[PDB]
Each structure stands twice: as C-alpha cells, then as structure tokens.
Amino acid sequence: AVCPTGLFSNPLCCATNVLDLIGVDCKTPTIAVDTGAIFQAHCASKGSKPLCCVAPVADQALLCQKAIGT
Numbered sequence: 001a002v003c004p005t006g007l008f009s010n011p012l013c014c015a016t017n018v019l020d021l022i023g024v025d026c027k028t029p030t031i032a033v034d035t036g037a038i039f040q041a042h043c044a045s046k047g048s049k050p051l052c053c054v055a056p057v058a059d060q061a062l063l064c065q066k067a068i069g070t
C-alpha cells in the first residue's frame with residue numbers, strides 16, 4: 001500500500017500541498033499504483049503531488065499527508 005492505514009489511506013494526485021496538511025485540486029490515479037516510485041512518477045506526469053488523503057474521490061480540497069519519502 002502506498003498510503004498508511006487509517007485516516008490518510010487514499011492515494012490522490014493533487015496540484016498543491018498546502019501547509020503539509022491539505023491537497024488542492026486532487027485527481028484519482030488513472031492506474032493502479034503499486035509502489036511509492038510509481039505513485040510519485042504517476043502524479044508528476046499529471047503535474048501533481050502524490051498525497052495520501054482522507055477520502056478516495058476527486059475533490060477541490062482535502063485533508064492529506066505527503067506520500068512517504070517525498
């Protein structure tokens with residue numbers, strides 16, 4: 001799993017990480033993401049940051065944490 005269990009369990013690709021706490025303009029990955037490296041590269045291909053967020057759907061703004069090692 002590319003995100004931790006619990007609250008911040010959903011991988012999204014978000015345009016901006018605000019305050020290391022919020023994802024803005026969050027897109028669902030268009031592929032299965034198997035590893036941190038794939039998650040990072042996939043979100044970068046969409047001009048976005050790999051974040052682990054409180055909900056799994058596309059959204060304007062969500063509480064998120066950065067993917068580990070980023």
Ligand SMILES: [Mn+2]
Pocket residue numbers: 024025060
């Ligand atoms: Mn927006």
